[PDB]
Amino acid sequence: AVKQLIVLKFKDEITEAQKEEFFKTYVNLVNIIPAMKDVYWGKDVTQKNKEEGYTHIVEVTFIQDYIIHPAHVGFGDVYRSFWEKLLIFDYTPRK
Amino acid sequence: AVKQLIVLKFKDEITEAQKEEFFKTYVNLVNIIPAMKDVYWGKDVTQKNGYTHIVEVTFVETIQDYIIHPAHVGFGDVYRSFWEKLLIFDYTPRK
């Protein structure tokens, strides 16, 4: 199974309630994007690399059907102003 | 459950065989460290952004035990010349 890791920092203007609604909306995308099987998210507690400033993590389990899906594109349309930086990684987890 | 996410880029001199050995050793750490419950790793395929690899470790208090642990310290002592940069995040996955 294939995973997508999203690492992000929100702009300073964005409030806590706004972030909770951002993640809740992204989690509910699972029910309307057939490619999306699972989503978890989390906030970094240790701030080991605070020079970089990334604060949150999203784990999505599945990608082209998702990328152009209007729900996915629409989510990007609504919330793009929320994030100051963003890294995306796609990979197959192994041992 | 608490997860540790490690994002890294290797030095250009590091070879594919070395990286494979790096990850197999890191994965076997689950056998030596009681706090370490599970490990997966993967290589980013998309290159959307310089980071190339991810490691997912499954366990916050029992993270301190891992961090100080001689096997974890020893792993860093062996292999830290391998990586050019790394990010580390600790979080509790939720939805």
UniProtKB/Swiss-Prot annotation, chain A:
Kindly report the protein's main subcellular placement as a broad class: cytoplasm
Instruction: List the expressing tissues.
Output: Expressed in glandular trichomes and at lower levels in female flowers.
Q: Pfam families annotated for this entry?
A: Dabb
Recorded consequence of changing residue 56 to A: Total loss of activity
In UniProt terms, what is the effect of altering residue 66 to F? Total loss of activity
User: Annotated Gene Ontology MF terms?
Assistant: cyclase activity; lyase activity; metal ion binding
Which superkingdom is the protein from? Eukaryota
What functional role does this protein have? Involved in the biosynthesis of cannabinoids-related terpenophenolic natural products, which have pharmacological activity. Polyketide cyclase which functions in concert with OLS/TKS to form olivetolic acid. Has no intrinsic polyketide synthase activity and requires the presence of OLS to produce olivetolic acid.
What's the name of the protein? Olivetolic acid cyclase
The species this protein was found in: Cannabis sativa
